Design a binder for this molecule. Structure first.
Ligand SMILES: CC(C)(COP(=O)(O)OP(=O)(O)OC[C@H]1O[C@@H](n2cnc3c(N)ncnc32)[C@H](O)[C@@H]1OP(=O)(O)O)[C@@H](O)C(=O)NCCC(=O)NCCSC(=O)c1ccccc1
Ligand SMILES: CC(C)(COP(=O)(O)OP(=O)(O)OC[C@H]1O[C@@H](n2cnc3c(N)ncnc32)[C@H](O)[C@@H]1OP(=O)(O)O)[C@@H](O)C(=O)NCCC(=O)NCCSC(=O)c1ccccc1
Ligand SMILES: Nc1nc2c(c(=O)[nH]1)N[C@H]1C(S)=C(S)[C@@H](COP(=O)(O)O)O[C@H]1N2
Ligand SMILES: Nc1nc2c(c(=O)[nH]1)N[C@H]1C(S)=C(S)[C@@H](COP(=O)(O)O)O[C@H]1N2
Ligand SMILES: Nc1nc2c(c(=O)[nH]1)N[C@H]1C(S)=C(S)[C@@H](COP(=O)(O)O)O[C@H]1N2
Ligand SMILES: Nc1nc2c(c(=O)[nH]1)N[C@H]1C(S)=C(S)[C@@H](COP(=O)(O)O)O[C@H]1N2
Ligand code: SF4
Ligand code: SF4
Ligand SMILES: [Mg+2]
Ligand SMILES: [Mg+2]
Ligand SMILES: [W+6]
Ligand SMILES: [W+6]
Lengths: 653, 653
């Protein structure tokens, strides 16, 4: 029998209203583990490149990680996968909370949606009971608001609900899916969900979930908890607060945001304010945050409590975590009070807290320059704050100028013209990046910006420190108990690495060292997004409780399959290449893999070419970014190599 | 991980030439075991009643039993299922030999064909490699002949081949599938295969097949091999050799056919020859058999060697077992030399050995009577023997009157008319029966002739004795060591049974007694056809090694699921009802459940009514043969009851 996984999925046709439970192939588990990996397998051989994002044949997959529903601490992530309406590439999005584990308790590993529903509806799951309900009375309702009404309707107080706001219903290219203190935020997956007339997905589960090696599996679980205690008694020395400990960026706990407000760019990723964090500002923000934060809350089976309930006066309560705390504030040249109030509106609407702020600031720059006229913004209010609330409503409704801005900075500038493309200066593969315009070229981050399939920098980094220690004693101390490294050489790299001089960036670490680092950091994220493990306890923070050495044990004891360190490394490489192959088939080439032209002020073309060339070699790809026939056959992806040749993507010989 | 079964099937669309391996649902195994069981499930919810047998939507399935490819002695049966072109009902047909086990070693449980290939093809399976080959150079070739050329083409001497003959290609309604010394013979499965344009299925396998509890399973295997040694040293006293030991009827060993020739109707189930077995006949048949029989051969993993390679002077070699040894002979009022000769042609042509002889025999009665003219048989030889060879050619080619006769006796008489219906007197549901026209009504066999879904009396009988003993001492001796009975009450039945007196047929055994006997006998067959076990070691002979008490142990140790006598009983009841439900949906009713009008000289209309009334009650059926909503709900077949009501077959309460 199957373990960790349930071995079953739901196939839903929203056009015919048909529902079907189908057993999964156990071979898929051995090759692609689960979550993102198996999502990639499904999208590959069911979604050909001729399928458009808002086409009925486009798929919307809700996947619970392999180890979700087990006692594994923090393992609770949902992986939503589809074809992005913004980037035209694959879009996988992660969501925390309690939804994924509930699905497992209901008896399912995934839910795959195809076609479209003519009427607004939501899916109701209660163990073996599955049905489609009408949701017309929920039209326009906010994401969180929607969940509460449903749980009253069905009389299921303990059901978990993933819903879309008005933004998703109106197919905003950066619309999200909201569930309590969790969000599948990026990729426009909310736009696809709305396009299919799917207002929400409600699931309740009370079945058992089994593991293969009970005693052994709980042993590793306790080993993690013990490490979390010890780790939280020994934070990383001389790092900032929101990087010393475990979990997601603890921005709800720490009031200090000097690193953020003085190193990140305000507005449309435009302005840098070196001396913003004054005493008056630090006190005003701490007061606002103490009054707004009700409680620090956690996800399922996790003690880190990264999120927080936010209560602004005269506004409904919503939940928040990580960097969305500042994006609306910094993009509007305002304060933390404004940011918390508009984030409430945006979370209910279901918008990406990264792109949305940059799109609105992008619009005001165009209005400032004169590329957009005041006639495009009728009835526009005077205040800077009021203008953001104004433009926010225009976007979610796709009203007038809001209809164009609802497509993202790339497509909006494309349609606007008149030099609007010049102000879309912060995109990679048509996707907005973090507002960061640094001085000196970073050889490690350059690679992560160019090749990251998530196209987000915060979701590929983690395991290697972002900066070197000034003193050698500090490095020797760090590498002392750095048991998470796959190889001793990662310790030796950090020892030699210095902030200034003959061993500083961009010329050090070397090109070969950078490639190895990027490959390791990326590998841990892909393992996380297949197992369902929150990165906060794994691939994100320094020296995590989960790593390349005990992960194989969790899989073996949990799922009952043969798994070791090397076999796991190869597995992660397998469906990370498959994801790559999916984007190749959709027209992605080396040309698309370049950072923004103004991302760094000091550029080194010859070093950057050597970096991307060497990294491709390590991955086993072409000098155009395409996985060769040799590496594909070696990975067990022969059917990919055949289709590449047949499609002319790869040449025979 | 799955056990005994491989857990995969092959989905092949012949019209599109697509090949696909699909993991199965382990719940189907729990409810329907496998083989014939799971095949019924597949046909039920994929082949609705509006589908024609020669429609491309009709399915042809090759299933290997649950315990095929395991060390279990005699377990190697293939189960072919489809919708019969002759009866318009469900058709399942069993084939022995070496084919099923081979499929298991390749890594598959079933092959499921849909659609029609426009050109003659065959499927080549070698482990993970599966491809469709052009087979136009094989057109017209015989089943066995086709096999040898194919194996040489592929350089695969250890490959197993199931093939159709010309008869299958020309969609003769009783065309068969031949696999060396084994054949799927009845129902017209060869017709559907030819109709789809499938000449053969070649399979080679070299993969491991695992069992769950090794030590316990091989222990069970050793228990059977012991019982076989002891059974062969103790044949059932006062029973003729062919039916006094294990295996299929050993007619290839025993020359003595006094019982058959003097009790079975020669010709068109017409002539009883009470004193046919003379000294001169016996010596002649003995001489022919001794010179013809090259060697007694077995199936995979069995020591009984029921088969015999037959070599007639001037003819190629073929394999034969059981009763075809007499059918062609008796139908033509000929001898054994002719029988063995023509049966070589018939086997290579791919024809059923029960119907062909009766069909040809039926035609000559119509010619003798006047309904058919010499004009219908142009080029008709003068000799009896030469006429049968002539009409055999006409049928396989569907040439002239061979087109009409190729549809069977039921439809032939329907189309011929002019009173030809009267000579189609040996039918049940448009399916030719054994040439048996006894004197006194047998209550036990009456119920079997009416309800058996195979519609063939020899594939439902077995566990209970066909006749009583003259002496009580004989009865007491037999029931002393009769461990295979499901209850003690069977022992008491046999003891009371007498050939003459108050305790003789038709009045004894009683109606309730007769029902319990038919139920037991039928149940054992369905377990065999699901597991893949040969009836010659189970449901066919008296006191077999496999039985209702040790069968659960095999299923548990073999497949690794829970099982016991009562669960197994109900499990067999579940998919016997399912098969019953499939034919009810195709229009079958009580009216169709009647033996030939002249099957018994002495009839008892009132007893016959009570007999069937009672049997329907034990089954849990209506007074019209249809399974009640209750028993369907009780068997976990709730989906069936719903559709029945929806279709109006069952009144809503
Ligand atoms: C200190 C760094 C490492 C880089 O900041 P800086 O120190 O400012 O580095 P700079 O490149 O600006 O150069 C500084 C000055 O020194 C100069 N100079 C430089 N090198 C050299 C040299 N070798 N030799 C000599 N001089 C050198 C250089 O010319 C410049 O001087 P000028 O003004 O031009 O005259 C850190 O702040 C960082 O974030 N980096 C990681 C990358 C990243 O973005 N990761 C975060 C992803 S988001 C995330 O994780 C998150 C988001 C939300 C929520 C949660 C999480
Ligand atoms: C002896 C029987 C039991 C029946 O044969 P018989 O003895 O002839 O039984 P009858 O019914 O013909 O009557 C005889 C005479 O006695 C008379 N009479 C009868 N009852 C009574 C009474 N109670 N009281 C008084 N008198 C009674 C009756 O009137 C008649 O006298 P008349 O001439 O009319 O004046 C046996 O031969 C048999 O095969 N039966 C099993 C059923 C079957 O067909 N199974 C095989 C399936 S194929 C197979 O397995 C296989 C095929 C190929 C390869 C391998 C396998
Ligand atoms: N497995 C996994 N966990 C992850 C992440 C991820 O990308 N993969 N992202 C982290 C970051 S940067 C944030 S801001 C939060 C957001 O969690 P959410 O998806 O529930 O909103 O998740 C964290 N946990
Ligand atoms: N509306 C909204 N957008 C959001 C967030 C959020 O909490 N709400 N979280 C941000 C954070 S912290 C992260 S790490 C990314 C997570 O990426 P993903 O949700 O696409 O996997 O989304 C960002 N966008
Ligand atoms: N499981 C099972 N085994 C069975 C049978 C059957 O119907 N089911 N038929 C028996 C009989 S009567 C005969 S004659 C032989 C025929 O073997 P064949 O189908 O390979 O020609 O199978 C024997 N074994
Ligand atoms: N061509 C051919 N027809 C045959 C046979 C055979 O061996 N070859 N077996 C006969 C016997 S003895 C029996 S019991 C049935 C078996 O039925 P089935 O093979 O359709 O399951 O087929 C009959 N027809
Ligand atoms: S580390 Fe934070 S975001 Fe991750 S599971 Fe724990 S509480 Fe949730
Ligand atoms: S008993 Fe006879 S027919 Fe059955 S498997 Fe053994 S040899 Fe073959
Ligand atoms: Mg998220
Ligand atoms: Mg057969
Ligand atoms: W983040
Ligand atoms: W037989």
């Amino acid at each position: 029998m199957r373990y960790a996984e349930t071995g079953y999925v739901l196939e839903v046709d929203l056009t015919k209203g048909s529902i079907e439970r189908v057993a999964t192939d156990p071979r898929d588990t051995e090759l692609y583990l689960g979550g993102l990996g198996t999502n990639a397998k499904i999208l590959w051989d069911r979604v050909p490149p001729e399928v458009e994002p808002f086409s009925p044949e486009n798929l919307l997959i809700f996947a619970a990680g392999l180890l979700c529903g087990t006692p594994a601490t923090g393992c609770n992530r949902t992986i939503v996968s589809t074809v992005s309406p913004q980037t035209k590439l694959m879009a996988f999005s992660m969501m925390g909370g309690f939804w994924a584990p509930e699905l497992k308790y209901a008896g399912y590993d995934k839910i795959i949606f195809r076609g479209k529903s003519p009427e607004l509806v939501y899916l109701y799951i209660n163990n073996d009971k599955v049905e489609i309900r009408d949701a017309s009375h929920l039209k326009g309702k906010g994401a969180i608001e929607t969940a509460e009404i449903i749980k009253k309707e069905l009389n299921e107080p303990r059901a978990q609900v993933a819903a879309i706001g008005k933004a998703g219903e109106n197919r905003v290219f950066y619309a999200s899916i909201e569930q309590g203190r969790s969000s599948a935020s990026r990729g426009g997956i909310g736009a696809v969900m709305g396009d299919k007339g799917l207002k929400a997905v409600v699931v309740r589960g009370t079945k058992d979930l089994c593991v293969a090696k009970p005693e052994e599996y709980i042993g590793l679980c306790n080993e993690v908890l013990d490490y979390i205690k010890h780790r939280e008694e020994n934070p990383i020395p001389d790092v900032m607060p929101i990087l010393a400990g475990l979990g997601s960026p603890q921005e709800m706990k720490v009031h200090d945001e000097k690193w953020h407000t003085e190193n990140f760019n305000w507005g449309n990723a435009r302005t840098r304010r070196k001396d913003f964090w004054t005493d008056e500002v630090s006190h005003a923000w701490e007061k606002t945050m103490d009054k707004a934060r009700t409680r620090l809350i956690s996800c399922y089976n996790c003690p880190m409590k990264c999120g927080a309930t936010i209560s602004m006066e005269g506004l409904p309560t919503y939940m928040m975590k990580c960097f969305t705390k500042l994006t609306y504030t910094m993009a509007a040249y305002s304060d933390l009070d404004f940011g918390l109030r508009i984030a409430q509106k945006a979370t209910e609407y279901g918008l990406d807290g990264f792109s949305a702020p940059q799109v609105m600031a992008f619009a005001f720059e165009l209005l400032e320059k004169g590329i957009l006229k005041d006639s495009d913004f009728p009835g526009l209010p005077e205040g800077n704050e009021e203008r953001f609330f104004y433009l926010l409503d225009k976007i979610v409704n796709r009203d007038g100028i809001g209809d164009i801005l609802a497509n993202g900075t790339y497509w909006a500038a494309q349609e606007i013209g008149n030099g609007a493309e010049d102000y879309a200066h912060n995109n990679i593969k048509k996707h907005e990046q973090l507002p960061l315009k640094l001085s000196m070229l970073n050889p490690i981050y350059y690679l992560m910006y160019c090749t990251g399939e998530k196209i987000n920098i915060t979701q590929i980094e983690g395991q290697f420190p972002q900066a070197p220690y000034p003193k050698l004693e500090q490095r020797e101390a760090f590498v002392e108990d750095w048991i998470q490294v796959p190889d001793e050489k990662f310790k030796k790299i950090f020892l030699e690495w210095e902030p200034r001089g003959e061993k500083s960036m961009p010329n050090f670490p070397t090109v070969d060292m950078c490639c190895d680092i990027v490959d390791w950091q990326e590998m841990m994220h892909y393992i996380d997004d297949a197992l369902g493990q929150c990165a906060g306890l794994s691939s994100f923070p320094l020296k995590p409780p989960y790593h390349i050495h005990n992960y194989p044990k969790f899989i073996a004891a949990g799922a009952g399959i043969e798994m070791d360190t090397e076999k796991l490394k190869k597995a992660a490489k397998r469906y990370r290449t498959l994801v790559r192959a999916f984007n190749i088939r959709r027209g992605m080439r080396r040309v698309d893999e370049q950072p923004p032209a103004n991302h760094w002020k000091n550029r080194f073309p010859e070093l950057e070419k050597e970096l991307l060339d060497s990294y491709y070699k390590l991955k086993g790809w072409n000098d155009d970014g395409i996985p060769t026939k040799e590496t594909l056959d070696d990975l067990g992806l022969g059917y990919v190599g055949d289709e590449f040749i047949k499609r002319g993507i790869l040449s025979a010989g």
